[PDB]
Symmetry: C3
Subunit: 213 residues, 3 copies
């Protein structure tokens, strides 16, 4: 897209895993981001699921410029505009709607929107998108669905998210249609509480190393 | 919009179970509704799956003031207007479309529409809705799928329906995202056919009591 | 029925129990493959828009094998629908649906049997007057159980499930009241097609038709 200098494909090809981040306490955002980056995971999906999320995006953008920071759980144009102004470099949505797709394609940052079904994929493709989130992946029919959902759509590429962990992420990464996966396991809620940044860095390092096929 | 004197949330919080009613003979409708009310179940989803359904809603609306009667399997604005005219206090649909969402939100009674995917949830939220049916619940991936679908959406609430029975309804009621559940087991076709209203009352009371804890 | 369609979508699905999902890589294979399928008793040919020669294959089959009911699959938008209609497709199948595709289809001249996975998608198709749908991808959608539940509140709709259907499971679907036929790729194996092994294609079609009987 001539409106998106940073392509959706570039976001998804940066690394094999995109952490789904829920940050309950702002003060933890920056050291969490540094811990991820130290472990080799740079694309951070900061979800709009807590009050401090947008402030977390602004903080990480300023203090951790090697992190590629984006907003998740973006549901509508208002939230998309808010995170764009706050410095999000991309947006992820759990599903798609026409107002959100229209706003995204009119704006400056890539949206990688979730789909569950081929009709939803077709709607996103009608807006010119070719990279999608597959969410919730396990609930959608999993790897077998992508071998099938992605079938008639040889050119479309995905980031599956939802019920993915070290036990199964390789099953997804093995697919030609999959560029990367997402999951919350890299930033456990209690690790942030405990200031266990070492644990976060280790999970990141393990996830990247464990991804080599 | 302000348009609904009865909120969707009030329909879903009246009690833990909403019977999915399929009534083939009109003469059965009023005694069936009375039998449910006697068992403590008083939100009655009369599905538009039989010729007599709208007449059944009309009769129950007039004769059983201790029940709140509504219509289910409402597919389109034509049906919505019919059940509104007949005295339905709410409408349930198995999925959603924009013409149905527009007509409902512009109209006088709450619509609780089914969804299966997050995109469908988001389209409903674009029309201001926050209470949905999760249908067909077991075919949508059950409790786990519902937990994943509901996760990015802390505020949304559900009524799962489809494949729910005493064997599994507590699993759904245990979830923070669930207000009540729907099921056809409270009004079995053979009970209606045999005029066993006593058994309907017992099924209703068993359901209500079994929902506690 | 749809005022602009000379052929009903229902008639497409009631032609036979099995609709082959065809991926044709080289044009010269298209006509003999079509004749081989017809000779095995299978004549509704879903030529998917997954290869460069697909549209020319539809045109060739429409010309040389007019006794086949040839159509186009993997139709994703109004442009592709118009293109296949001009080529001689007698119907169109899509893996999913969108409002622009539904609108173009109902204004156009050939039946569209579009894929759905959820009841909201079914309801959108129904808003356009459609009653015949594909259920895709069937097995990953949750198979016969899913289809049973989804089809429940919808007694008049009929389906063609496609996606993971095989001789192992197709009778499971064909036994359902809501199912008229199924789609499958096993009748036209890629290697048979490239090898020009047409007797094998005929045998597989004949076996599929006989095995469909309940």
């Amino acid at each position: 897209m001539k409106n998106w200098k940073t392509s959706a494909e570039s976001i998804l090809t940066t690394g094999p895993v995109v952490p789904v981040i829920v940050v309950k306490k702002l003060e933890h955002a920056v050291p969490m981001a540094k811990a991820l980056v130290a472990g080799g995971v740079r694309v951070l999906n900061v979800t709009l699921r807590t009050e401090c999320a947008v402030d977390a995006i602004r903080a990480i953008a300023k203090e951790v410029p090697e992190a590629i920071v984006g907003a998740g759980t973006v549901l509508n144009p208002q939230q998309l505009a808010e995170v764009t102004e706050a410095g999000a470099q991309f947006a992820i949505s759990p599903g798609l709607t026409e107002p959100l797709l229209k706003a995204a394609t009119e704006g400056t940052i890539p949206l990688i929107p979730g789909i569950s079904t081929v009709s939803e994929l077709m709607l996103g493709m009608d807006y010119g998108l070719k990279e999608f989130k597959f969410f919730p992946a396990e609930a959608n029919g999993g790897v077998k669905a992508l071998q099938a959902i992605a079938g008639p759509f040889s050119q479309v590429r995905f980031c599956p998210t939802g019920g993915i962990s070290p036990a199964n992420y390789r099953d997804y990464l093995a697919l030609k249609s999959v560029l990367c996966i997402g999951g919350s396991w890299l930033v456990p809620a209690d690790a942030l509480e405990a200031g266990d940044y070492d644990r976060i860095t280790k999970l990141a390092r393990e996830a990247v190393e464990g991804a080599k096929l």
